Amino acid sequence: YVSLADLERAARDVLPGEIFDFLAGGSGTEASLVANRTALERVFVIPRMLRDLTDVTTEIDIFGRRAALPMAVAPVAYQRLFHPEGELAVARAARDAGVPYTICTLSSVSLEEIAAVGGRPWFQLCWLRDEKRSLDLVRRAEDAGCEAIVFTVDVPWMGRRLRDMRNGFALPEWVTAANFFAPATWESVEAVRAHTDLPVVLKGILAVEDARRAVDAGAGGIVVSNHGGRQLDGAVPGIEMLGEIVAAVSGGCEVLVDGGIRSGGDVLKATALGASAVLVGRPVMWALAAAGQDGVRQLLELLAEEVRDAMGLAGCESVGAARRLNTKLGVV
Amino acid sequence: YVSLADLERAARDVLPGEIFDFLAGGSGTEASLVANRTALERVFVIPRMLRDLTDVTTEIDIFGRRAALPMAVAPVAYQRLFHPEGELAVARAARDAGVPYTICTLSSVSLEEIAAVGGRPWFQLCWLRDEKRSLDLVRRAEDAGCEAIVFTVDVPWMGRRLRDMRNGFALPEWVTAANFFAPATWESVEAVRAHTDLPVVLKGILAVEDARRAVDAGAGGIVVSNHGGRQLDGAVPGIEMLGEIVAAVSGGCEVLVDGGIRSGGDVLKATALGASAVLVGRPVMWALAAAGQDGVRQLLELLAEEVRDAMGLAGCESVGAARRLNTKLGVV
Amino acid sequence: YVSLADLERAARDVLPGEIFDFLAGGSGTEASLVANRTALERVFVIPRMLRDLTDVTTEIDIFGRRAALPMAVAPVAYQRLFHPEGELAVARAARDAGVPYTICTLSSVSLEEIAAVGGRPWFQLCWLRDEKRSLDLVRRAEDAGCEAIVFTVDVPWMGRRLRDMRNGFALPEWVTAANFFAPATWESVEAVRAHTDLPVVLKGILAVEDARRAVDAGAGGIVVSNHGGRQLDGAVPGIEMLGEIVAAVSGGCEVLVDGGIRSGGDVLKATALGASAVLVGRPVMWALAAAGQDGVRQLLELLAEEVRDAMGLAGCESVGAARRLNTKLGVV
Amino acid sequence: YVSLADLERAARDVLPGEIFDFLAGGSGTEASLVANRTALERVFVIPRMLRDLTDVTTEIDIFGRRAALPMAVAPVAYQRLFHPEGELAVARAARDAGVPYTICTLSSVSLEEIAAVGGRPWFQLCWLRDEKRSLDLVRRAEDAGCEAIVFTVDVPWMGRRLRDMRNGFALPEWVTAANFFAPATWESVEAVRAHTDLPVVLKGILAVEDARRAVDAGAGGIVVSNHGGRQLDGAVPGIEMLGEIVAAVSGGCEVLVDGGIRSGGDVLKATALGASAVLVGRPVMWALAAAGQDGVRQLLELLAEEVRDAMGLAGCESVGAARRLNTKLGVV
Ligand SMILES: Cc1cc2nc3c(=O)[nH]c(=O)nc-3n(C[C@H](O)[C@H](O)[C@H](O)COP(=O)(O)O)c2cc1C
Ligand SMILES: Cc1cc2nc3c(=O)[nH]c(=O)nc-3n(C[C@H](O)[C@H](O)[C@H](O)COP(=O)(O)O)c2cc1C
Ligand SMILES: Cc1cc2nc3c(=O)[nH]c(=O)nc-3n(C[C@H](O)[C@H](O)[C@H](O)COP(=O)(O)O)c2cc1C
Ligand SMILES: Cc1cc2nc3c(=O)[nH]c(=O)nc-3n(C[C@H](O)[C@H](O)[C@H](O)COP(=O)(O)O)c2cc1C
Ligand SMILES: O=C(O)C(=O)c1ccccc1
Ligand SMILES: O=C(O)C(=O)c1ccccc1
Ligand SMILES: O=C(O)C(=O)c1ccccc1
Ligand SMILES: O=C(O)C(=O)c1ccccc1
């Protein structure tokens, strides 16, 4: 594979149609899904030349750990839908690549099993029925060695995925929520923050004042995100809010972004707009569906090469230098 | 049906071509018809997270009545063109859904019959030949229990609908104006205002100074509208003037908008731009053509679900909160 | 015919391909040809409502004559290419419609014959070899009763029309320049101005300072124009410069525009941007090719109806009112 | 041939697919390749009228030599890929046309042989392994009569060309680097500047501060360029940075641009945005592939005619006048 798009076509061949649709789809008319790509494609980088590139490194420090790339695997529920080894295959490849892996509340393998793979994983939280049960998941994750709590804050309930409705899609018998909901509020965030010493990362922030409030609330990071266009149809892409949010936060927390990152060049664009790091969702599942653990390994090796390539061509010996790049909006 | 677009395809199958064209078409090159959709698609919402959604309500108070949604059925003449029960089917479904229904001057069932359905209806006025006859329609409507007069102000005469011309379209023998024209002016508006205690709503305002003058003239509301692209071809979409008009009116009257509203997400966009409520026209007729009263019921139930979904995903427990959402223009 | 586009299709059937290409084509990649349409389509009118329309008139006074519409027939050379009656057919229809007709220097019927048709015609000048011969054409035109000199100022030489090159197109034996070149300069303009009491109109102005200089030079009007995309490929559309030019001239001369005017709605857009009047070129030749004099009559009757329709729907009882309309740029 | 596009189609027929792909392709998704064209197409010229065109000249003085056009042949490696006479054919045609030719470090004919053709050539430098060897190439070029050193500064390494990867493309046995790499830095530039009295031209500048630093570093010129979209995928087109860079440099060095120049009209656009001259790459190779030396001659004759045509139609008797033209961005 020489691009991430090679993997999508590979995954479309192997996966049952309704499972491919569950993976690919968005809510409503899929306007926000498409806009995630359109918005990235409008961004152009202004590269710098003639800088010292003797020691180009793509590494970052985030949430107390060195990562090999400014990237983590996004939370994607029920990964056994895509391959029999599910989350274990993905976590093993992420570990080997030096990339953080986000364990889901709705993982199809238990969080303790996935954490035992190693690789200093993160844990994504869905707010439950009950403050007490929510906090027990958090404590489980922490006890198992997870290093950050990625609190999903854009799912008071799940969006209307019309492909799934039309397909009559439901979980197969053989896929379960192996770790086993009410709308989260700022009170929920405070309950989590008080219950753990781990950094709390709020995933799904788009409004500038919600980013500011996240810092005020003691968040260690946010993910600027419209949930891959799967939640509010018509929600602005995260990439379009990122610059404004980075300015408003003024270094008070890590600012990640996701939605449609499909190459090292896209990672460079996100960094140039001010992101600390990106999450990548669907492409990791394409790789998993296509070729299991080895597929995810190949994807991460490709992304690593593309990120190094893009950084050097843009005159950046470090991710910090890439954040100081300027950009220009074009038309496509 | 899981989207409004499902209903358009259903209606295209059942309706005679020339009747579908009468319904779907615009004036001239249909530039303003298409622009109504293009303009909505360019609007993106910036949703808020982590707000209290224990008691989400889509209700509003408007013109002295509670409505179940920030939506009314737009005036559409001659509804027996689309189904034998015509206006009665639509008014019954609107009543049952808690949605105001606008009775037309050119209704194919008499306004008194439609009003007897109940549901606290509105009445749309075409200015007639004669101040005295115009005012008699208004008095009839008021006597029959209509709760607002929706004065159409963008039809000094009807626009040039080229589909209708090419089709040689005319009313069938079996469809008549059951309630049985000169250009309206500001004098006409004053005559109506002096003749009724009902709120007068001016439908078809696009210029900011006409919105201001509407308030000065004693209007209780306006509908920011290019008449679904059926009047001046090249008229700006209402959705593109809405923000400016809401600012200029500064709460002096209700500001509604119509043109291309095709989902709860579109309703959210209109509200975020400052609308009090929307009108929906063609989709209600698609539902009527497809399945009569039950079709319109299903459409309104779908819209209700989509509006609740969109509001909650955007962190809005009330329509007032949705009006305080910010937006960002994108490219499509 | 119910639109101008009906006539283009009619003309494509009857005309030899290479003659249709001579008519339709532009220079280079035809970027400026296409941009004339794209630019008009981006303009939206903000119509006014509820104004007195008891005496709507589309008439204007220009260059000392009343015209029935804010429109004249553009200069198009060699009209016998399109119909055997050529310029006589077009001039007769223009006369009957009350529309000025521009007689070309390269007319295929002599200017005296065309002037004898009546209808108070204009005369378009190509600068010749020789100040003396150029001025003799001007004097001929004036002696024959022409009422304005339309000096073409954007043709120091003719543009590169690649359709014509590829077709190997040349004038048929049966078409000649019946009135029988060097680049014009500001000196040429002064020579013409000193030689006639007729208003001199400079056709092909796009730069704001050239519009200002035209007024300083004693021009009675200008046509803001890129010559229908037939001269510099990449020249900005006139419609995109019109507002700026109207502001700069501040009433010092008439400001006309041409390029892609294809409906009464387009005329309204041009007027709302500040034009005194428009020229229409290719559509008049479509009508001529399709049905001779009667074709041109039908075209002008259609345009008259569309202009009246658009003005009234926009609340304008006069062309002066239409010039005070505001506009908004959209996306298409 | 009547356009440059005629030559691309001619070249596609004759060349092996993988060689055509090597020539045509870009890096990554080819976003920057496409954007070079999209950006030029958005630029419109505001032409001037009625100026003296008695002595229109397309000549410029640059780097101490008169050139017949504001254009040079871009450096393109390995020209024997496209025709057996390779660089000699192109250099002979450039000489005969009065156009500078850029001899490549990776030329498939030795730089001394190509220089012996005459025509006062330029030499493009790839920074080598070794300051000493790099400087020896420079001295060779200077000794052979090259008149400028075009230091490529946007290739710390080569970009990822996916067409080449997918094709498994490599140099044929019969093509070699007849003159026979480390990332260049500002230190490398200074080493070159100190080693030659020839003007040093930095090719591949996009950031305004890199243009400023180039002047500070003693560069005689820069080429504002994203390397034809072959290096960083997502790099802004040079044409989009050109105006800002010309303002920042304030006459301190020559500012050239390349990327997608495909007509004399495009040359005019570049000049109107402030360029001293353009480079043309792929079209010269199309002409070479299509018809060898005579093909390149025909291409340069066509470009000369198109540049003269465009300048005169825009009222410019000299390239300096063309630089004073204004432009307007449109939509396409
Ligand atoms: C199939 C699927 C399942 C997902 N499950 C979750 C989830 O459980 N929790 C969460 O916060 N986000 C979830 N997401 C959202 C992703 O974390 C991510 O925000 C989104 O996919 C955008 O990134 P992408 O374009 O790289 O896929 C899911 C996305 C997909 C496609
Ligand atoms: C078939 C049809 C008939 C209409 N009749 C009327 C009418 O009698 N009075 C009026 O004010 N608007 C009338 N309208 C305009 C609508 O009230 C509304 O402004 C327009 O359809 C835009 O909304 P939509 O895109 O939701 O259809 C009509 C529209 C249609 C399509
Ligand atoms: C076939 C043809 C011949 C023309 N001949 C002339 C001419 O002789 N003099 C002139 O000033 N313009 C000439 N024009 C330009 C037109 O007057 C006008 O500026 C142009 O066609 C743009 O208007 P349109 O889009 O309505 O055709 C010609 C245009 C065409 C298509
Ligand atoms: C096949 C090919 C080989 C090239 N080789 C070089 C090179 O050796 N050195 C260099 O500085 N640029 C090289 N370039 C870049 C060109 O000089 C030029 O910047 C680019 O092609 C953009 O111009 P165009 O759109 O006119 O082709 C090459 C381009 C192509 C297509
Ligand atoms: O988060 C999601 O987008 C998603 O599709 C999902 C669906 C079911 C359970 C958890 C997440
Ligand atoms: O209002 C309309 O758009 C419309 O189409 C119409 C047609 C006839 C009578 C009333 C309204
Ligand atoms: O003016 C023109 O555009 C044109 O096509 C023309 C061609 C020959 C003679 C006069 C005008
Ligand atoms: O510069 C280039 O773009 C290019 O394609 C190339 C490839 C091999 C050697 C030198 C240049």
Numbering used by the authors:
A (entry chain A), B (entry chain A), C (entry chain A), D (entry chain A): 3 to 182, 206 to 357
Give excerpts from the publication.
Its Y128F single mutant unexpectedly shows a new reactivity and is able to oxidize mandelate to benzoate via benzoylformate, a four-electron oxidation reaction that is typically catalysed by a monooxygenase. In this report, both biochemical and structural measures were exploited in an attempt to address how a single O atom dictates the oxidation level in the reactions catalyzed by wild-type Hmo and its Y128F mutant.
The Y128C mutant (in which the bulky phenyl group is replaced by a sulfhydryl group) that can transform (S)-mandelate to benzoate was used to assess the extent of active-site perturbation.
